[PDB]
Ligand binder design. Structure first.
Ligand SMILES: C#C[C@]1(C)[C@H](O)[C@@H](CO[P@@](=O)(N[C@@H](C)C(=O)OC(C)C)Oc2ccccc2)O[C@H]1n1ccc(=O)[nH]c1=O
Ligand SMILES: CCCCc1oc2ccccc2c1C(=O)c1cc(I)c(OCCN(CC)CC)c(I)c1
Ligand SMILES: [Ca+2]
Lengths: 820, 284, 100, 49
C-alpha cells in the first residue's frame, strides 16, 4: 500500500496542478469529479488502517494525525457544496484548504526529521527572537506613521502606494524597506514630503538609514543564529606533447582563442573586424587540429571535449546553433590546470551535498504557487485608463494628461493589458514567486494583487489589503527561513571538513624569523631618529591627516583650497625629507608604508606643479591627496590585521574566483550571440547603458543582474517582440523579430549559478579565515608572539641570530604573564 | 533608607500586579496603532477619542511610577523617562491653547520588553553580539568617507544639465524614462527628442537628491550605492553627464569593495562569534 | 620634459640598484617610471583635447606609438613595484621587513 | 639579492627600456594628428606643426 498511496497522492497533486484560467469545460468537470473519487479513496484507506493498527496507536504520530483533519475537512466541504455559497473569494478560500493534502509528499522524506526535531525543541527561542523583530517593526511603523503619516499630499497625479497613511500600510512600507527593495524611492518620497533637498528636509533620511542598518543587523543575527544552531544540533544527532612548454603554449592558445571569440561584432554579420576574427579563429583551429593528432599517436573523459570543440570548429571551416556552441573553448582549461579541476570537483561535491533543502524549498514554492493560482487567477488584467473595468469597455481612444495638466492632452488607444508576472497557471505562479524570492519587483506584484477585483475585471484601488499576508508569509518562510538554512548548511558542512593551539604555537616558534629595526649610529642622526620615532610625531601627523581630510570635504559646487593644498604638500614633503635623513634611505624603503608615502607625496608634488603651471597659462591627479588617509591604516592594528587576513585568504583561493570569471565570460558571450541584435531604445531596459552589443556591456549587464537589480525587467526586455537594430541585417518586412524566449532559461540559470558560486566563494574565504575568526583573545595568540618579536627587535637592531646571555634576563620582565 | 513611614505600598508588587501593567501597555500600543494621521491639522471622532484616552494611560503610568519609587536601574529609568515625556507633553498641550514632540510616544512598546525577562536577555545577547563588529564598522565608515570625497572631486556639479523643450522650462522625456543628465558638445549624452535642447539650471536627477554636489549628498549617494539599491541609476546618470569610459571603474570597485567584501567580513565575524558562543556553552 | 626627467631619474635609480647590493632602490625607480608614464598619458590626453577643439582625425602611426609607450611604462613600473615588494605574509609568523 | 637577478625582473626591466626608448623617439615623430579640411593633411605635434 506504500506505492499505492504514493500513486494516489501523485494523482491528487496532478489534479490540483492542472487548474488554470480559462480552462475548458471538460477539464473543470473532470477536476470536480476527480475530487470525489480521491476523497472516497482516502476515506477507504483511513478505515482499513483503523482496524489494521487499532484506534489507540494511530494518534501517537503526527504523521497520521492530520489525515483525519484532511478527510473531515473534505467531507465537510463536499457537504457544504450544495449550499448557497456566494462570495467567489470566499468559496476560493474554502478551495484553499483542499490544498493542505499536499503535505503527503513531504510526509515521505525522513532526512528532514532530524532538523525539524531541533526546530520543535527550539520553537520557544524562535518565537522569542521573531517577537523581538516584530516589536522592532511595530515601533518603526509607528514612528513612520508619526513622521510621514498624512504628509504625502502631493499635487501631482503620481501614485505612491508605499506610504504611512495607516498602520497596515506603514507595516508594509517598513517591511519593504527591511527587505531593501526600492527603499530609496520611499526615502525620496519622505524627503520630498518635507521641504526637499534642504537643510532640515534631508534629515529624515536618518530614519531610513537607521531602519535599514538596524533591521538588517537584527535579521542577520536572528536568522543566522537559528540556522547555524539548529543545523549544528541536527548534524550532532546525525553522527549519533608532455613537456611543460607544449602545455603552456596550448593554454596560451586557449586564452587567445577565448579573447578572439569574446571581442566580436554581433550586430554586423559582414564587417571588417569579423573577417580578421575568422582568420584568427581558423589559424587557432589549425594549431589545435595538429595538437589532437599528436596526442592520440602516443596514447590510446576530458579529451572528448577537445575533440568535440575541434569538430564543431572545423565544421564551420538550426544552422546557427553550432555557432553559439563554440563557447566551450574556455572550458578547455579545466584539464590543464590541476587546481581548476580540483575546485570544479569540489563544487560538484558541494552541489550533490545540498540536495534535500533544494527539493523541499522547491516543493514548498510549488504549494505556494498553487495557493497563489487559487487566489489571483485571472485577476491581473488591466486597461490603459483605470476607468474601463472590462475588456469590452477597454476599446477606442482616451486622453492622457502629461505632468497632470488638464490643458496638455494627448491621445492614446485603449488596450486590455496583462501583467508580465501573473498567477494564471502553476508555471506563471512559480515564475512570479521566484521573482518575489529575489526581492525584485515584489512590491509591484503585492500592490497589483491588493487591487485584484474579479476574474475578468480591472483593479480596484486598495480593494484587498489583507492580500499582503500571502506575500509577507511567503517572504518570511522562503526568502528568509529556508534560504538562511541553505546558507547555514554550507557553513557547517565546510566547518566539518576544516591539541591544535600548542601545535600552532610550536609551529610559530619553529618557523619564526626576526625582523629588522634599523637602530642608527651617528648621534646627530640619532636625534632625528628619536624625534621621528617618538609617538608625539605620529600623533601630530595623524592630526594633520585628519585636518587634511576635513579640508578635503569642505569643497562644494557653487579660492582657499589652493593655498591649503600647497601647505599640506609642503608639510608632507618635509616629512619625506626628515624620514630619508633619519633612515639614510636604506631602511626607509624597506617599509611598504613608506613606499606608499613616497608615491603619494610625489603624486601630490606633481599635482601642485601642474596646478601652478595651469595658473601660469589632469583631473585625476587630484586623487593622490585623497589617498593620504590610506596611510592612517598603519595605526589601527585591528583593522589592518583583519584586512590582511581576509586579503591573504582571497589570494589563497583564486581558482574559486576563476569559476565566477569563467561563468561571466561564457554567459556574456552567449548573451551577445542571443540578444546582441536588440535595438537601443529609451524607455526600455535595453538602451545605451544596458545592452549585449559589446563584451564589456554584456559583462556590466551580468554584473548588474548579479547585484540584484531589476533583472526580471531585463528578462522581459528580451522575448521575441523587440525591434531589431537598424544596422543589423534582417529581411525587409519584418523588424520586430529580435529577442528569444530562451531569455527565461538564460536569466534564471544565471541568477541561480551566480548566487551559488558567490555563496561558495564567501564560505571558502570564511573557512580559510576560521583560525583567526574563532580565536580566544585571552588565553594566547600570535599577537603576543608578534609583540615578543617587536620587543626583541627593540633589544636587537639586526637579526644576527640570538643576543647576549645577560641581556636575556631583562627582557623576560617585559613579557606578559600570559606569555611569561 | 527611610523608616517604615512610607513603605506601606510594597505589598502589591509581589502580587501579579505586573500583568495589569503589561495589559495596559498592550492597550496603549493598540491605541497608538488605530490612530489615523490626517493632513493639515485634520481629525475625526476616533482621533479625538484617543486623545482623551491618552490621559488614562498617563495617570496609570504616573501612579505606578510614584508607587514604585516610594517603596524603593537601567530598565526602570526608561519607564521614568517615558512617563516624564508623556506628562511633559500633556502639560505643554493644554497651556499653548508642537506636534513634533508627540513622536516620543512610540517608545511605549519598549516597556513590553522591559516587562518580560525573556526578551530582556534576548536583547542583551543581541547587543553583546555587536562588539566584535566594531572594526568592520570603522572600515565601512572609512571606505564611505574615501569614496564620498573621490566622488566629490570627480562628479561635482556635473549632473545639472538636462534637455528641456525649445524655449520652455519643461523637461523632455519619453513614456517610461526618468529624467537624466545631458551634455552638449562633449563626451556625454545628447538628447534625441525633436523639439529639445540641452541647457543648465536643472536641480538634479532624483528631484535634486542624487548628486555629488557637497559632502553630505555625496555621502548619501555613496551609502545608497553600497546597499546596491539603485547604484546602476547613479552610474548611468554619471555616464550621461560625462561619458561611459571612466566612471564604471569607480562604481564597480565601490560595489565590489563596500558591498561584497564588507558583507563577507560581517558574515565571517558573525559566524565566528556564533561558533565561539556555541562551543563555550557546550561545556556547560 | 618633466616626464623625461622622471625617466632619467628612474634609469639612474635602476642602474644604481644593481651595484653593491642596493636591492632597495628598485621601488623608487619603478614609481618614477609610473609617474613618467602618467605624465606622458596626460600629455597625450591634452593633445587629443587640442586636436578635438580644432571633419575627422585619424590615428595611424604616432598616436598608437605614444599609447603603447604609456602602457609599457605604466605596466612595467607597476610590475617592478609589485615584484620588488617581498611577499604577502600568508602566515601568522611571517611578516614584512623580516630577515631576508 | 633574490629579486635582483630574477628573470622576471629582467623581463620587466627590458620592457621598461623598450618603452623609454620608444617614448624618447616618439617625442619628435609628430605623426598622430592629421586634419583633412575637405588635400591639406596636416601634421600636428608637441614641438613643431
Ligand atoms: C534575505 C536577505 C538579506 C537582507 C539580503 O537580501 C542577502 C544578500 O545576499 P544573498 O542574497 N546571497 C547571494 C544571492 C549573493 O550573490 O549576494 C548578493 C546578491 C548581495 O542571501 C544571504 C547572504 C548571507 C547570509 C544569509 C542570506 O543577505 C541578507 N543580509 C545582507 C546584508 C546585511 O547587513 N544583513 C542581511 O540580513
Ligand atoms: C547548480 C547551482 C544551483 C543553485 C540553487 O538551486 C536552488 C534551488 C532552489 C532554491 C535555491 C537554489 C539555489 C541557490 O543557490 C540560491 C537561490 C536564491 I533565489 C537565493 O536568494 C537570492 C535573493 N536574496 C535577496 C537578494 C533572497 C535571500 C540564494 I542566497 C541562493
Ligand atoms: Ca532591487
Amino acid at each position: 500500500f506504500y506505492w499505492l498511496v504514493i500513486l494516489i497522492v501523485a494523482l491528487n497533486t496532478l489534479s490540483i496542478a492542472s487548474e488554470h484560467h480559462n480552462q475548458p469545460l471538460w477539464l473543470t468537470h473532470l477536476q470536480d469529479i476527480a475530487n470525489r473519487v480521491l476523497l472516497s479513496l482516502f476515506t477507504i484507506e483511513m478505515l482499513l488502517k483503523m482496524y489494521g493498527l487499532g484506534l489507540r496507536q494511530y494518534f501517537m504520530s503526527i504523521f497520521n494525525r492530520f489525515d483525519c483533519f484532511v478527510v473531515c475537512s473534505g467531507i465537510l466541504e463536499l457537504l457544504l457544496v450544495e449550499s448557497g455559497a456566494m462570495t467567489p473569494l470566499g468559496i476560493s478560500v474554502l478551495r484553499c484548504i483542499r490544498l493542505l493534502r499536499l503535505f503527503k509528499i513531504t510526509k515521505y522524506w525522513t532526512s528532514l526529521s532530524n532538523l525539524v526535531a531541533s526546530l520543535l525543541n527550539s520553537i520557544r527561542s524562535i518565537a522569542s527572537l521573531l517577537l523581538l523583530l516584530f516589536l522592532f517593526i511595530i515601533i518603526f511603523a509607528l514612528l513612520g506613521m508619526q513622521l510621514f503619516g498624512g504628509r504625502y499630499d502631493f499635487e501631482d497625479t503620481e501614485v505612491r502606494r508605499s506610504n504611512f497613511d495607516n498602520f497596515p500600510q506603514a507595516l508594509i512600507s517598513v517591511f519593504q524597506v527591511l527587505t531593501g527593495e526600492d527603499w530609496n524611492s520611499v526615502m525620496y518620497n519622505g524627503i520630498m514630503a518635507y521641504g526637499g533637498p534642504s537643510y532640515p528636509g534631508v534629515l529624515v533620511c536618518i530614519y531610513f538609514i537607521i531602519l535599514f542598518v538596524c533591521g538588517n543587523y537584527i535579521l542577520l543575527n536572528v536568522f543566522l543564529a537559528i540556522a547555524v544552531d539548529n543545523l549544528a544540533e541536527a548534524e550532532s544527532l546525525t553522527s549519533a606533447v608532455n613537456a611543460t612548454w607544449f602545455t603552456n603554449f596550448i593554454l596560451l592558445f586557449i586564452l587567445l582563442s577565448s579573447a578572439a571569440l569574446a571581442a566580436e561584432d554581433p550586430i554586423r554579420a559582414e564587417s571588417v573586424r569579423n573577417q580578421i576574427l575568422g582568420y584568427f579563429d581558423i589559424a587557432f583551429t589549425s594549431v589545435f587540429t595538429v595538437e589532437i593528432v599528436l596526442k592520440m599517436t602516443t596514447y590510446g573523459y576530458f579529451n572528448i571535449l577537445d575533440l568535440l570543440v575541434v569538430a564543431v570548429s572545423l565544421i564551420s571551416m538550426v544552422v546557427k546553433i553550432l555557432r553559439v556552441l563554440r563557447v566551450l573553448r574556455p572550458l578547455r582549461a579545466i584539464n590543464r590546470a590541476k587546481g581548476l579541476k580540483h575546485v570544479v570537483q569540489c563544487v560538484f561535491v558541494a552541489i550533490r551535498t545540498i540536495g534535500n533543502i533544494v527539493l523541499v524549498t522547491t516543493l514548498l514554492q510549488f504549494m505556494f504557487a498553487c495557493i497563489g493560482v487559487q487566489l489571483f487567477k485571472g485577476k491581473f488584467f488591466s486597461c490603459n485608463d483605470l476607468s474601463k473595468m472590462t475588456e469590452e469597455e477597454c476599446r477606442g481612444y482616451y486622453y492622457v494628461y502629461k505632468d497632470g495638466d488638464p490643458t496638455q492632452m494627448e491621445l492614446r488607444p485603449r488596450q486590455w493589458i496583462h501583467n508580465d508576472f501573473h498567477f494564471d497557471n502553476v508555471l506563471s505562479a512559480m515564475m512570479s514567486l521566484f521573482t518575489v524570492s529575489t526581492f525584485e519587483g515584489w512590491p509591484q506584484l503585492l500592490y497589483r494583487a491588493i487591487d485584484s477585483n474579479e476574474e475578468d475585471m480591472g483593479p480596484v484601488y486598495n480593494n484587498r489589503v489583507e492580500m499582503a499576508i500571502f506575500f509577507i508569509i511567503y517572504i518570511i518562510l522562503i526568502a528568509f527561513f529556508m534560504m538562511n538554512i541553505f546558507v547555514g548548511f554550507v557553513i557547517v558542512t565546510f566547518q566539518e571538513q576544516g591539541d591544535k593551539n600548542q601545535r600552532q604555537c610550536v609551529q610559530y616558534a619553529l618557523k619564526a624569523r626576526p625582523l629588522r629595526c634599523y637602530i642608527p649610529k651617528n648621534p646627530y642622526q640619532y636625534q632625528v631618529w628619536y624625534v621621528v620615532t617618538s609617538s608625539y610625531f605620529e600623533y601630530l601627523m595623524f592630526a594633520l591627516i585628519m585636518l587634511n581630510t576635513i579640508c578635503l570635504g569642505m569643497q562644494h559646487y557653487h579660492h582657499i583650497s589652493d593655498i591649503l593644498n600647497v601647505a599640506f604638500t609642503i608639510i608632507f614633503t618635509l616629512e619625506m625629507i626628515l624620514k630619508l635623513l633619519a633612515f639614510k634611505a636604506r631602511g626607509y624603503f624597506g617599509d611598504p608604508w613608506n613606499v606608499f608615502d613616497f608615491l603619494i607625496v610625489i603624486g601630490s608634488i606633481i599635482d601642485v606643479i601642474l596646478s601652478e603651471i595651469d595658473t601660469f597659462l589632469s583631473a585625476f591627479f587630484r586623487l593622490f591627496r585623497v589617498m593620504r588617509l590610506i596611510k592612517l591604516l598603519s595605526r589601527a592594528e585591528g583593522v589592518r590585521t583583519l584586512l590582511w587576513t581576509f586579503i591573504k585568504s582571497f589570494q589563497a583561493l583564486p581558482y574559486v574566483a576563476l569559476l565566477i570569471v569563467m561563468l561571466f565570460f561564457i554567459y556574456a558571450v552567449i548573451g551577445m550571440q542571443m540578444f546582441g541584435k536588440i535595438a537601443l531604445v529609451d524607455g526600455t531596459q535595453i538602451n545605451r547603458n544596458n545592452n549585449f552589443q559589446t563584451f564589456p556591456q554584456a559583462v556590466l549587464l551580468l554584473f548588474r543582474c548579479a547585484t540584484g537589480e531589476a533583472w526580471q525587467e531585463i528578462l522581459l526586455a528580451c522575448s521575441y517582440g523587440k525591434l531589431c537594430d537598424p544596422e543589423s541585417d534582417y529581411a525587409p518586412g519584418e523588424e520586430y523579430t529580435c529577442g528569444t524566449n530562451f531569455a527565461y532559461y538564460y536569466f534564471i540559470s544565471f541568477y541561480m549559478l551566480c548566487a551559488f558560486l558567490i555563496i561558495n566563494l564567501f564560505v571558502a574565504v570564511i573557512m580559510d579565515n576560521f583560525d583567526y575568526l574563532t580565536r580566544d583573545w585571552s588565553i594566547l595568540g600570535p599577537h603576543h608572539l608578534d609583540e615578543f618579536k617587536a620587543i626583541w627587535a627593540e633589544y636587537d637592531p639586526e637579526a644576527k641570530g640570538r643576543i647576549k646571555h645577560l641581556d636575556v634576563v631583562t627582557l623576560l620582565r617585559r613579557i606578559q604573564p600570559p606569555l611569561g | 533608607q527611610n523608616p517604615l513611614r512610607k513603605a506601606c505600598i510594597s505589598i502589591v508588587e509581589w502580587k501579579p500586579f505586573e500583568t495589569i501593567i503589561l495589559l495596559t501597555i498592550f492597550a496603549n500600543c493598540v491605541a497608538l496603532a488605530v490612530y489615523l494621521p490626517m493632513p493639515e491639522d485634520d481629525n475625526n471622532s476616533l482621533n479625538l477619542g484617543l486623545e482623551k484616552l491618552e490621559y488614562f494611560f498617563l495617570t496609570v503610568f504616573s501612579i505606578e511610577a510614584a508607587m514604585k519609587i516610594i517603596a524603593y536601574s537601567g530598565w526602570n529609568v526608561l519607564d521614568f523617562i517615558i512617563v516624564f515625556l508623556g506628562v511633559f507633553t500633556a502639560i505643554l498641550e493644554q497651556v499653548n491653547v508642537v506636534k513634533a514632540l508627540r513622536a516620543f510616544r512610540v517608545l511605549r512598546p519598549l516597556r513590553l520588553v522591559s516587562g518580560v525577562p525573556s526578551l530582556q536577555v534576548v536583547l542583551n545577547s543581541i547587543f553583546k553580539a555587536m562588539l566584535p563588529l566594531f572594526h568592520i564598522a570603522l572600515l565601512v565608515l572609512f571606505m564611505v568617507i574615501i569614496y564620498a570625497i573621490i566622488g566629490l572631486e570627480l562628479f561635482k556639479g556635473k549632473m545639472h544639465k538636462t534637455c528641456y523643450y525649445i524655449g520652455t522650462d519643461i523637461v523632455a522625456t519619453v513614456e517610461n524614462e526618468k529624467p537624466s543628465p545631458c551634455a552638449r558638445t562633449g563626451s556625454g549624452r545628447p538628447c534625441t527628442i525633436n523639439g529639445s535642447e540641452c541647457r543648465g539650471g536643472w536641480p538634479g536627477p532624483n528631484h535634486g537628491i542624487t548628486h555629488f554636489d557637497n559632502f553630505g549628498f555625496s555621502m548619501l549617494t555613496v551609502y545608497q550605492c553600497i546597499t546596491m539599491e539603485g547604484w546602476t541609476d547613479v552610474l548611468y546618470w554619471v555616464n550621461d553627464a560625462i561619458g561611459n569610459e571612466w566612471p564604471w571603474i569607480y562604481f564597480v570597485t565601490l560595489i565590489l569593495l563596500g558591498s561584497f567584501f564588507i558583507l563577507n567580513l560581517v558574515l565571517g565575524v558573525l559566524s565566528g562569534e556564533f561558533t565561539k558562543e556555541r562551543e563555550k556553552a557546550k561545556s556547560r | 620634459v618633466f616626464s623625461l626627467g622622471f625617466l632619467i631619474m628612474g634609469t639612474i635609480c635602476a642602474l644604481m640598484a644593481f651595484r653593491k647590493k642596493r636591492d632597495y632602490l628598485l621601488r623608487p625607480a619603478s614609481m618614477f617610471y609610473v609617474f613618467a608614464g602618467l605624465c606622458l598619458f596626460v600629455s597625450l590626453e591634452v593633445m587629443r583635447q587640442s586636436v578635438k577643439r580644432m571633419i575627422e582625425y585619424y590615428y595611424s602611426w604616432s598616436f598608437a606609438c605614444a599609447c603603447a609607450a604609456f602602457v609599457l611604462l605604466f605596466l612595467g613600473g607597476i610590475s617592478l613595484l609589485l615584484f620588488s615588494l617581498p611577499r604577502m605574509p600568508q602566515n601568522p609568523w611571517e611578516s614584512c621587513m623580516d630577515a631576508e | 639579492m633574490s629579486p635582483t637577478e630574477a628573470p622576471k625582473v629582467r623581463v620587466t626591466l627590458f620592457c621598461i627600456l623598450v618603452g623609454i626608448v620608444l617614448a624618447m623617439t616618439a617625442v619628435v615623430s609628430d605623426h598622430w594628428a592629421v586634419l583633412s579640411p575637405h588635400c591639406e593633411a596636416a601634421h600636428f605635434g608637441l614641438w613643431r606643426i
